[PDB]
Structure formats: structure tokens, C-alpha cells
Write a protein that binds this ligand. Structure first.
Ligand SMILES: Nc1ncnc2c1ncn2[C@@H]1O[C@H](COP(=O)(O)OP(=O)(O)OP(=O)(O)O)[C@@H](O)[C@H]1O
Ligand SMILES: [Mg+2]
Lengths: 49, 229
């Protein structure tokens, strides 16, 4: 169970869980999360890459 | 023209192995230069040697000494008032103070402190999280108002939001000074085409030095840099 300061390293995970200020936001596989573009994870991986 | 060390040999113990050997370093006047390398490769050691913390087995350090602002790798605060240790015995300036803090993004973290700005923290006061310690350590050097500011892995306990904010605001403010050299080492090569000079090293020994027209000499090292897109 990983905590990531590098969203690019967590990319190889089986399931990614996103956290807002106190709750999960749509735990899912990384592919769908990055493809949705509505995920905050998309903003992360796009501002970091 | 500024700080330079030709063929330096530095060590920790005068009987052990000469940890750093055959180094040639340059830091231009009023620029932004970074140092990178592997883990434990010796990226803080060169710096502490160029700060006078290592008996040089050989070589020659040349300056201009000066009250160089600094932030150790592990952030370290004082057993005193938050204002008192971010100021650090400087003539208090409301404008510069608030500007530095906004640059370090500490206002929402100050608001949660019981006495706000004048909260008495330290090893005797109330304790807090490593992110705030790191930000205070950076603010101490930013408010320091020294010619050669100097950082050591500030982007360690910081996420992407706060790292972006600090980098952008603080470092662009530093560059906004007519002449204010700042030297920060980091692991994220993300901000390479923002640094005016680059120093890469491995196993202590330096490899290359040059920002763009020198990063075109080989594809192995530059591909290693761009491995993370
Ligand atoms: N305070 C110390 N006392 C003794 N040896 C040290 C000390 N600090 C570092 N060393 C040794 O010197 C070598 C270089 O250490 P240095 O602190 O430069 O690592 P670094 O590359 O800056 O760290 P990081 O990779 O975490 O940024 C290391 O192999 C370490 O074993
Ligand atoms: Mg180090």
C-alpha cells in the first residue's frame, strides 16, 4: 500500500486511490483515472511529467 | 568568476578515504545553478566542503567569505518564536517578512498555530510536521538577505502544489534581485530548463557542467535525465 510523492512512480499500481481533504475520490485503475481528465490524478501526472 | 574550486580533494576523516576527489566547480555571479546526482553520490558533501566543513586534503577554494544563507538537508528550527527564528536577528521588515512567508506558503499553516505568528515552537514548544519545518528552514534563508543564498534539498517534504509555489515565487523573487545567487540541490530534474547552470556528479566525482549547449554532448546522460518525461 503506497503513499506517493511521485505520481509517476505510483503509476504501475493495480489500483490508485485519490484523497481530497478527508475522503477518497473514485478509487480506480490508473489508466481510467488518467484517461478521464476529470480526475485530480490527471492534473497531477500532467503537471509533473 | 565567483566561488570556484579547481582539483579539490575533500574528506570527512583525515585518515579515511578521500571522499571527494578531483572536482572543478564554478558558480556564476547572480545566477541559478543546481547540483544533481545519485543518492548519496556526494551532492551535499561538495556543498559543505565549499562552506568550510571539510578539511581539504588538497585543492583551492576561492570566494569573491560571506554570511551565506543556508538550509541543512534535515530542516532545523530554533527553540524560539516562529517570527523570532524566521527573522533570525535581522531588522524586522513587515513587507519583506510577509512576502517571504507568502512565497513559502505558510499563512494557512500559521493560522492553525495557537498564537499564530508568535507561537512558541521548538524542542520545548509545540511540535509540528516536517513540511512546516522545511518551509520555515527555507524562509530563514530567504529572509536572510545574503548575496549567495544556498539551499540543500528544500523540496523533500513538499508536494507538487507547494513545491511549484515555492520554486516559482521564491526563486523568481531571488532572480528578481539584481545580483543574488542561489544554489539549491534537488532530485526532481523537472525544473532543469529553469536553472542557469547545472552540475552533475556521481560517486563524488563531477561529470559535466553546463546548462543547454553542454547537455547536447551525449544522449546517454540526457536520456537518463529525460527518463521520467
Ligand atoms: N555527516 C557525515 N559524517 C560522515 N560521513 C558522511 C556524512 N555525510 C555524508 N557522509 C558520507 O559521504 C558520502 C556523501 O554524502 P552526502 O551527504 O554528500 O550524500 P548526498 O548525495 O548529498 O545525499 P543525498 O543523496 O541524500 O542527497 C556518503 O556516502 C556518506 O556515507
Ligand atoms: Mg546528502
Amino acid at each position: 500500500v503506497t503513499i506517493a510523492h511521485r505520481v509517476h512512480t505510483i503509476l504501475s499500481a493495480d489500483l490508485v486511490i485519490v484523497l481530497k481533504r478527508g475522503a477518497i475520490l473514485e478509487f480506480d485503475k490508473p489508466e481510467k483515472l488518467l484517461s478521464r481528465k476529470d480526475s485530480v490524478f490527471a492534473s497531477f501526472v500532467r503537471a509533473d511529467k | 568568476c565567483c566561488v570556484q574550486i579547481m582539483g579539490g580533494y575533500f574528506t570527512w576523516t583525515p585518515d579515511g578515504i578521500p571522499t571527494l576527489s578531483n572536482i572543478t566547480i564554478r558558480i556564476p555571479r547572480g545566477q541559478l545553478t543546481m547540483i544533481v546526482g545519485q543518492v548519496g553520490c556526494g551532492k551535499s558533501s561538495l556543498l559543505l566542503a565549499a562552506l568550510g566543513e571539510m578539511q581539504k586534503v588538497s585543492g583551492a577554494v576561492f570566494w569573491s567569505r560571506g554570511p551565506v544563507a543556508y538550509a541543512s538537508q534535515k530542516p532545523w528550527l530554533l527553540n524560539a518564536t516562529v517570527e523570532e527564528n524566521i527573522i533570525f536577528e535581522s531588522p524586522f521588515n513587515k513587507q519583506r517578512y510577509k512576502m517571504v512567508i507568502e512565497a513559502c506558503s505558510l499563512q494557512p499553516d500559521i493560522d492553525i498555530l495557537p498564537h499564530g505568528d508568535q507561537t512558541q515552537i521548538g524542542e520545548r514548544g509545540i511540535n509540528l510536521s516536517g513540511g512546516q519545518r522545511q518551509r520555515i528552514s527555507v524562509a530563514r534563508a530567504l529572509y536572510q538577505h545574503a548575496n549567495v543564498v544556498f539551499l540543500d534539498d528544500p523540496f523533500s517534504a513538499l508536494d507538487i502544489h507547494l513545491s511549484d509555489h515555492l520554486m516559482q515565487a521564491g526563486i523568481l523573487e531571488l532572480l528578481r534581485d539584481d545580483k543574488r545567487t542561489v544554489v539549491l540541490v534537488t532530485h526532481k530534474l523537472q525544473y532543469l530548463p529553469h536553472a542557469d547552470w547545472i552540475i552533475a556528479m556521481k560517486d563524488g566525482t563531477i561529470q559535466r557542467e553546463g546548462t543547454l549547449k553542454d547537455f547536447q554532448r551525449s544522449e546517454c546522460q540526457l536520456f537518463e535525465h529525460w527518463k521520467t518525461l
